[PDB]
C-alpha cells in the first residue's frame, strides 16, 4: 500500500529526418551549331556555376550578366546572348507545378538567325540565368543530405570549416559568409536582417543555405502527458499506472534518477509544462521534491517524474 501521485511525461524516438531550405544558382548555355546544312537541328547544351560577385547581385536586386567565360589549356571562350555584349538582364518568376519549387529565370535570346551551311552550319549561342528554391533532408548520423530534385551532397549540413563534422567534398569549394543580406522578390527595396550563409560549388550549379548549430536537431519527441498517474513500488520495480490512457509503464531500476546525457533539448519543454500544470493544481497539493527525476522503461521510452503530496488543510 505504497502509493504516490505526480505528473508524468513520456518521450519517444524521433524518426523524421532533419529538414531545411536551400537555393540554387546556375547558368545554362546552349549551342545549335549543328544545323545540318549538307535539314534538321542537333543542339547540345551545357551548364555552369556562378561566382561570388554575381550571387550578390541575384540575391538582392535580381539581376545577372549574360556572358560566360571558360578556360581550357590556356584557351578562353566567351559567349553572349544573341552574340551581344556584357549587359545586365533581369530575372522574372516562372510558372510551374503547384506546391513545388519556385523558379526565377531570365528571357532567352531575341532571335536565332540562320547562318552558313555544310561543314560550318548555322551556329547560335544562348545563355540563361536560373534560380530555384527547394528543401533538403538529412538523417541521424549526418553524412549527406538530398535536395528535392534528387541531388546528393556528401557533407554534413552543420559543417562550418572548423568543426569535426563529415566533409568529403573538394576542399577549395566551401566558404561561409557572415552578415549576408538576402531578400525576396516581393520586397525589393527593404533591408533584411544579416545572417550567416554557407556556399558550395558543385561544378554544374551552386548551393547555399543558412548555417546553424547542431543543437537545432534533437533525437527525442514528445508523445503524451498524463496528469494523475500513481506510482506503486513492487520491491524491484516501479509501476506508473494511469487510468486516463489506460496504460502502465514499468521500469527496471528502483532508484533511477538517471539524469539526461545528451537529451538536453527537453529541459525547456518539461520546465514549462510541469510548472504550468502544478500551478493549476497547487491549490491542494505541494511539491514533494525540487528536481525532476528521469527513468527508462523496458521499452524505449523516457519518463519525467515529479511527485506530489497533498496539503493537510
Amino acid at each position, epitope marked *: 500500500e505504497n502509493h504516490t501521485e505526480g505528473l508524468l511525461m513520456v518521450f519517444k524516438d524521433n524518426i523524421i529526418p532533419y529538414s531545411f531550405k536551400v537555393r540554387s544558382y546556375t547558368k545554362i548555355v546552349t549551342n545549335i551549331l549543328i544545323y545540318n546544312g549538307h535539314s534538321v537541328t542537333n543542339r547540345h547544351e551545357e551548364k555552369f556555376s556562378v561566382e561570388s560577385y554575381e550571387t550578390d547581385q541575384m540575391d538582392t536586386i535580381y539581376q545577372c550578366y549574360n556572358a560566360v567565360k571558360m578556360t581550357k589549356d590556356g584557351l578562353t571562350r566567351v559567349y553572349v546572348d544573341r552574340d551581344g555584349v556584357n549587359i545586365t538582364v533581369n530575372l522574372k518568376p516562372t510558372g510551374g507545378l503547384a506546391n513545388g519549387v519556385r523558379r526565377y529565370a531570365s528571357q532567352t535570346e531575341l532571335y536565332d538567325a540562320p547562318g552558313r551551311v555544310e561543314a560550318t552550319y548555322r551556329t547560335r549561342t544562348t545563355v540563361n540565368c536560373l534560380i530555384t528554391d527547394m528543401m533538403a533532408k538529412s538523417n541521424s548520423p549526418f553524412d549527406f543530405f538530398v535536395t528535392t530534385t534528387g541531388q546528393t551532397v556528401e557533407m554534413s549540413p552543420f559543417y562550418d570549416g572548423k568543426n569535426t563534422e563529415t566533409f568529403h567534398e573538394r576542399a577549395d569549394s566551401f566558404h561561409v559568409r557572415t552578415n549576408y543580406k538576402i531578400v525576396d522578390y516581393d520586397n525589393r527595396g527593404t*533591408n533584411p*536582417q544579416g545572417e550567416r550563409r554557407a556556399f558550395l560549388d558543385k561544378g554544374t550549379y551552386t548551393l547555399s543555405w543558412k548555417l546553424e548549430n547542431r543543437t537545432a536537431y534533437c533525437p527525442l519527441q514528445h508523445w503524451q502527458t498524463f496528469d494523475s498517474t500513481i506510482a506503486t513500488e513492487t520491491g524491484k520495480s516501479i509501476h506508473f499506472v494511469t487510468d486516463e490512457g489506460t496504460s502502465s509503464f514499468v521500469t527496471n531500476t528502483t532508484v533511477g534518477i538517471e539524469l539526461p546525457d545528451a537529451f538536453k533539448c527537453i529541459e525547456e519543454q518539461v520546465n514549462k509544462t510541469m510548472h504550468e500544470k502544478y500551478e493549476a493544481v497547487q491549490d491542494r497539493y505541494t511539491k514533494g521534491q525540487e528536481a525532476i527525476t528521469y527513468f527508462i522503461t523496458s521499452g524505449g521510452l523516457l519518463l519525467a517524474w515529479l511527485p506530489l503530496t497533498p496539503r493537510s488543510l
Partner: antibody
Amino acid sequence: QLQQPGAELVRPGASVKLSCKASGFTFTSYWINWVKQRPGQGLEWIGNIFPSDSYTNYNQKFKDKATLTVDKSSSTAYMLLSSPTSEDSAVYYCTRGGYRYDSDYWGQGTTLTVSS
Amino acid sequence: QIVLTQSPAIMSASPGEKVTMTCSASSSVTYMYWYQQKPGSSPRLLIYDTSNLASGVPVRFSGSGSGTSYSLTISRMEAEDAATYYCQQWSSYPYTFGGGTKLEIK
C-alpha cells in the same frame, strides 16, 4: 553626380514635371527615391521607381498626386504632379538607393513656387 | 507603417557635456539610420545599421541600440555640431522619418 534644376512657377490646375539628371554611374543598378521637404517640417517619402524595371512603389496616400517615369536612354527620372494646389510649396530631392554600403548620393533639391 | 518618435526636442546645450538623443519606434525595426541636416543644405548620412560609421564622419559620432530603442551619442561638441538630426527606418516599405531634434548652443 545628381543635379536637379529649380526655380519653377506652378499654376494650380496645371500639371508640373521635375527632372533629376543622373550620370557617372550605371543607371540600371540602383533606385531613384523622391522626398518632399516642407519648410519648417520633417522630411517625407513619396516613392521609388526602379530603373531597368517599372517597380514604382508609391506612398500610402500619394497615389492621386504623384507619377514617376524614367528614360533609360537619357538616364533621367521625372516626377509628375497632378492638379497641384497652393499648400504644397516645398523642396523636392531625388536620392539614390542601393543594398551596398558604398554610397547613397542625395540630390540638390528643386524649390517649388505656387501662388496666384 | 511604423511611426518614429523623437522625445528630445530642444538641446540648448553648451560645450563640455555629452548629449544623447533617442529615437523610439512603434514596432520592431531591423536597423536605423541617422541624418544630419544643416539649414539650407541637403542632409548627410552619419550612422548606418545603428553601429557603423559613414565616410568622412569623425570618430566622435557613434550610436547603438536594439529592438525599438536606439540613440546616438557624441563626445566633443563644437559650434558646428548644432543642426537637426533625423532617424529613418528601412524595413517597412513606407520610409517613415522621425520628428527631428534641434540643437542649440548657450
